[PDB]
Amino acid sequence: MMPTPVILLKEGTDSSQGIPQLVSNISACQVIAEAVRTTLGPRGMDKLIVDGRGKATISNDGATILKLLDVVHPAAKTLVDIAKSQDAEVGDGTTSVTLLAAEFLKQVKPYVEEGLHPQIIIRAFRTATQLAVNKIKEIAVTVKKADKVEQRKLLEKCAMTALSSKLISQQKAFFAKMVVDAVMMLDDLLQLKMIGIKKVQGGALEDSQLVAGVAFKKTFSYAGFEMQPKKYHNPKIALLNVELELKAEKDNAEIRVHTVEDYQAIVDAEWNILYDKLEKIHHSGAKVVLSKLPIGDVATQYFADRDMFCAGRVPEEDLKRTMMACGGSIQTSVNALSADVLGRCQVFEETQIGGERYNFFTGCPKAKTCTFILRGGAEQFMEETERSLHDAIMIVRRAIKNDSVVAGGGAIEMELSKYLRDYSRTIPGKQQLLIGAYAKALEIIPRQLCDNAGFDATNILNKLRARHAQGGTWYGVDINNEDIADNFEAFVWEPAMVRINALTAASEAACLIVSVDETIKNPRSTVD
Amino acid sequence: ASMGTLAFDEYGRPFLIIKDQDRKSRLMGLEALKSHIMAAKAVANTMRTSLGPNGLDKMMVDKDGDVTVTNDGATILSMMDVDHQIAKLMVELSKSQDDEIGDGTTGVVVLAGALLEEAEQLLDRGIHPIRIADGYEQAARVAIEHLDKISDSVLVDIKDTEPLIQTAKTTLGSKVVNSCHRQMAEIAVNAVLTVADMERRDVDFELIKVEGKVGGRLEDTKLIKGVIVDKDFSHPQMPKKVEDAKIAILTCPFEPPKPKTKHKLDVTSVEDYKALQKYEKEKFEEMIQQIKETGANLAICQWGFDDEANHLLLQNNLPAVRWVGGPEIELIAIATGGRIVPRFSELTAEKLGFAGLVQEISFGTTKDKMLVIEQCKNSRAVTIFIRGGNKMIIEEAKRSLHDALCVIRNLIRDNRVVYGGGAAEISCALAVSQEADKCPTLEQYAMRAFADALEVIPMALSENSGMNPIQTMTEVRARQVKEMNPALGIDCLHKGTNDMKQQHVIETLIGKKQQISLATQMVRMILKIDDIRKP
Amino acid sequence: CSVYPLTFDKNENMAAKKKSVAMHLSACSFTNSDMQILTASGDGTCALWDVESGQLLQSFHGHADVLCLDLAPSETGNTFVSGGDKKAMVWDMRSGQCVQAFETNSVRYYPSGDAFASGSDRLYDLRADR
Amino acid sequence: LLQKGIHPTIISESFQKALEKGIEILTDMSRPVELSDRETLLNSATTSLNSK
Ligand SMILES: Nc1ncnc2c1ncn2[C@@H]1O[C@H](COP(=O)(O)OP(=O)(O)O)[C@@H](O)[C@H]1O
Ligand SMILES: Nc1ncnc2c1ncn2[C@@H]1O[C@H](COP(=O)(O)OP(=O)(O)O)[C@@H](O)[C@H]1O
């Protein structure tokens, strides 16, 4: 190095190039993977992360844990990004992607240290991943008769398998049945905004319920609200986007009068406008009035005098769910309130749930939405319950799209590893080592399962390898008996697309990391 | 082990993974569980001295120096300034128990602490924490079933409130209002029963107004079948007492009307000025005459009014009060059976409320006057008015009465009760022990630990009462085993018997079930956490 | 903080008369009708003055020290809100009493009149006291 | 033991009794040995070095 009186790049630029930087990138990926290892499997554990503000997040979800981590390593951010991608596309397997990518990099690291050209490793990864995806699609079990009973059983089993790693795994059957029931009621797009998630503190997990309709928290009742009846047996619901208050007609409106008679006429005209809106609402036959905009005390007392229910400032999502459940239409004007634009539910009731008042719309026969009311002893408890239910909902939706399942517990990966090793033993030998390394790296998930459960990983892996070699496809890790068992017969079912996406994303991340040979870091601007 | 891994690469090049990783900390594995169990044990041991009739209050001080003396576990943990995350979890557990039930917010913390203390020695012997959590869940299910089995039903009728009064007394025994114990229980039961949907529906706490004023004596606390107001008659010369009052509730200020829209009234001549003056005077006269036409003897407004309206109201023998808050307006309308009228033109006789007595109350040498409305026909709203020797016992009485109201609400929701004094916990521990014998060996340790943790409540009760914990608890358990009686508990008050039926120590089944469930879920959640990443 | 110079440096534009005696200041604010001036000090008392006559109409003490004063324009007598204590207090000068209070520096009265901002160092509806 | 409500003096005496009983048990379980037996000495030394 020489002073170079006129330096080329800006002062403070950091550059790392060659094999050492690739090894450092691999080590960083290993470090990132190590942070989420113990969260995988029914014997997994949760991680607690505290931000600068002092708030704590407790999660078993790999994507959430990685996001809460403030990763700044350029190569390590790839694992976080592929975890986010797996979460977005599938919703489950956010830990498997990171473990698989890190294990790929770990397996190919010794060849990197030996001076092997990265392009060869990338080609081997691409070939192995294509073969593995083809094998997954080939051996995935599907039934082409599609009856309601067996479809329900498959959905419930997939939901239980996706749920048997979280803190609600004790009530996994209950939660999975409830999640499948909620999902089956969505119409054609399976929109997540049509499934409500209400978290109410206090109460056990078994106290959580699914509403065959819509339910939302009471919204800032005005004076005179407590005189309105709080139960109806065949109400008609008027969904409005209207401000029912005494207010200026328009922001730029101005009234100019020069006689006291006109003054009184103007005051009475404002009152008559409000009362005309209220009378138009009342004459429609509706008994429950919900508005997106504030409802004043005058309107509240007017509706109370008519034995009618009012609720203003209802959020957008709650009104949308109410429209999709009862079957009305949101009206910005009350001039044409026909029976077509009026909702209908069998029973409306306001009850108390753990110190909160909730309005319930039940008995809807043709509802296309649902609302989850989750009970728990803590804020993060309910948050992680919601995350687990979201994972289960995503899995159930994907199963609805295509019921192609593979046995979990590492059985699918053992089959893939055996197939890949058999393929690799029949090629010249430069690609054979790398494909064998890929197959060996595919063993990470069952080994991690055994390690988390406290087993002896080596013996279980040996038994699994021997069983797969001698015949058997769905033999995986049996956590309860500390042994191996037929996971397909044990109903440890996974959608095939979960493993397909996991392998694809892990391979792409590994190829991207290997392809980089030089990293350059520009000096910071506006450090402050 | 701590702060993470610091390697700086094997080639000497910088190795930065996480921003500010040198300033962050990390606890990995079993030591994190040990620290969390230790923190929960500390919190539970702090709480356990405030359990039972002989429990002692904690005297909390906030950041501003304000002092609160209380026995409520939820309040203590809410006002406690903690930094440990597990302590915050315990505080949230107490708040959850308070929200769902309203009573037993101290038992949950003690139970969770005992559960984690047993889990500590279970972990030291090489058992996976998930196994401990599963065993705890199984034992909790067994205990819940046993509670459902040994539960007893009580009558919730208004013609016989003795079981309700006994349950409220059991709830209030541990609080400082045990001096007025029976009166407090009676007023709480009457307040809940008066305002409640009789078809086993919810009890709306919005219609129970709890107000406390210094002075007087704690025994002066009374239930008013009406509304107490922190206002008084607007004009100083109006009569202080109105009997058989016909009440007109109004939300329009007694002022000349004005449009909400931006309006300008133009005066272009002397005739316009005279017309405006006459219009204002006639508006005042017209509103007063319209109020008087309905035959009302009293007017209540929300938005105040000016001098001319005041003098016209005084001149027409119309006592009035102004600036009554919205919630108080609603309460008055509900209690007196009258409607809320937004303007004078809509005021009719049928919208008038009725009250047998409206009076102004003095409070000694304090200048403060507070209005009372009572003797209504079928008032659906009630008010609890609390007097005391200082603000602190007033706040404590407020929260104790809230506990009693919540307990009676729980009885309204479900009428099944379980006798307290530690009898329920002892019976559940016995049931769990009996079930663990049939269970395979591996979960036996977790179930036995759950039973031992359940048995801490009688031990804490014996400790607070001065008795020897282990000896008394063992004797009571042996008596429960010998004779079939799940109602034998800890004689905290030294009444001379261990049977809680004669002592009338009664707890809601819902409360005990919620306690056990919440404690088990929080213990499982704490056991599942294995890493901490504080900055 | 904003104190205009003394001599007004003008040529008798019938506005040089300003009173501004300042016998009380942290929240001096002219009212709707200019005949009254409302000022507050660090003694926890809110003072109302008539600018024409030039004497204290009536002082308001219900708080510690008061900092921020905002007035709802209606005759300048209807209401004025003080948020100096952590206690937002509303007073009526037709009776000289605190009509309503909220136990929760830059309080702002909403133009509608049904609520008011309580910016400190929330939209509190006056119709519901929440 | 202390949390159960036992004074830390009954614990000491009970521990002394347990120590005496355990000493009796260990002495009962023991086996005589003589220095002329090289095999037992070698086994003891090997057992001592097994953990190093
Ligand atoms: N009952 C079970 N027995 C064995 N393995 C299971 C069982 N349930 C889930 N698994 C395994 O757990 C792994 C996924 O763990 P989990 O934390 O639920 O999702 P993620 O892949 O997002 O970490 C899957 O590979 C699956 O094989
Ligand atoms: N008279 C009594 N005799 C024996 N035990 C009682 C008596 N009254 C209350 N207890 C017990 O004291 C325990 C604590 O009750 P308390 O302190 O009122 O509320 P918390 O359960 O929130 O601590 C209860 O579990 C109850 O069984």
Ligand SMILES: [Mg+2]
């Ligand atoms: Mg999963």
Ligand SMILES: [Mg+2]
């Ligand atoms: Mg209690």
